Design an enzyme around this catalytic site. Structure first.
Site, PDB file in Angstrom:
ATOM      1  N   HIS A  56     -37.680  56.033  -8.920  1.00 44.26           N
ATOM      2  CA  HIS A  56     -38.119  57.126  -8.066  1.00 44.26           C
ATOM      3  C   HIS A  56     -39.625  57.341  -8.183  1.00 44.26           C
ATOM      4  CE1 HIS A  56     -33.933  59.242  -7.573  1.00 44.26           C
ATOM      5  NE2 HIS A  56     -33.989  58.046  -7.012  1.00 44.26           N
ATOM      6  N   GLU A  58     -41.468  59.837  -8.529  1.00 48.10           N
ATOM      7  CA  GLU A  58     -41.929  60.739  -9.582  1.00 48.10           C
ATOM      8  C   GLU A  58     -42.141  60.000 -10.893  1.00 48.10           C
ATOM      9  OE1 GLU A  58     -39.546  61.053  -7.396  1.00 48.10           O
ATOM     10  OE2 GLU A  58     -38.698  63.080  -7.329  1.00 48.10           O
ATOM     11  N   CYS A  87     -35.183  65.111  -8.125  1.00 39.95           N
ATOM     12  CA  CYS A  87     -33.783  65.081  -8.502  1.00 39.95           C
ATOM     13  C   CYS A  87     -33.602  65.447  -9.970  1.00 39.95           C
ATOM     14  CB  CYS A  87     -33.196  63.689  -8.256  1.00 39.95           C
ATOM     15  SG  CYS A  87     -33.598  62.454  -9.548  1.00 39.95           S
ATOM     16  N   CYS A  92     -35.371  62.500 -12.845  1.00 37.57           N
ATOM     17  CA  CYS A  92     -36.764  62.887 -12.618  1.00 37.57           C
ATOM     18  C   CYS A  92     -37.100  64.222 -13.275  1.00 37.57           C
ATOM     19  CB  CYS A  92     -37.066  62.933 -11.127  1.00 37.57           C
ATOM     20  SG  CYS A  92     -37.192  61.291 -10.407  1.00 37.57           S
TER      21      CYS A  92
HETATM   22 ZN   LIG Z   1     -35.510  61.349  -8.876  1.00 40.21          ZN
END
Ligand SMILES: [Zn+2]
Length: 182
Positions: A56, A58, A87, A92
């Site tokens: 992801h 992030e 999320c 994350c």
């Molecule tokens: Zn995430």
């Protein structure tokens, strides 16, 4: 620095719940140093990221923090203009929390275009970010236009809003504020 294609921006930062974009996140970031209430904007450290091959955006931002060569004796504010709120269930929120606990020279401001409520634990993600010290809010017209002007290969064209931008922004903002009420 590399500027994003306009269609990539509009398709991803749209906040209309009828526009589907659950497969991807775009995360535009900037960094400033805070010197006794005075801000040193550090344009060398601005850019954008998306999810790549299961990682992801992030976490990819966290990955590059070392390359920014931040001075741990200073204080920096990182700002994210992120197309989805982070999320919980794929890690994350927890990684950002742990990052901020270990990197106390960093403050994080998160402005999200939409809430990623596909994650059943999205409320827990938002509250975890808040309680790690991150300031979370929903992007408004002001921030959408700023991101268009700053990160997009726009060739001098002005920001063109999608229908309902303000309405959807305010509705998301009410939802977020109820979640983070405290
Ligand atoms: Zn995430």
């Amino acid at each position: 620095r590399y500027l994003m294609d306009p269609d990539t921006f509009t398709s991803n930062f749209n906040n209309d719940p009828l526009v589907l974009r659950r497969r991807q996140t775009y995360l535009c970031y900037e960094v400033e140093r805070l010197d006794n209430g005075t801000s040193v904007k550090m344009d060398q450290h601005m850019g954008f990221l998306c999810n790549e091959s299961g990682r992801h955006a992030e976490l990819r931002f966290l990955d590059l923090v070392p390359s920014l060569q931040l001075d741990p004796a200073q204080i920096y504010r990182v700002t994210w203009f992120i197309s989805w709120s982070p999320c919980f269930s794929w890690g994350c929120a927890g990684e950002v929390r742990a990052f901020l606990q270990e990197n106390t020279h960093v403050r994080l401001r998160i402005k999200a275009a939409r809430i990623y409520d596909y994650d059943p634990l999205y409320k827990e993600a938002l509250q975890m970010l808040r309680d790690a010290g991150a300031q979370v809010s929903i992007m408004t017209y002001d921030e959408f236009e700023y991101c268009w002007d700053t990160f997009v290969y726009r060739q001098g064209c002005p920001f063109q809003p999608w229908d309902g931008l303000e309405e959807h922004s305010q509705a998301l903002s009410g939802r977020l504020r109820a979640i983070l009420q405290l």
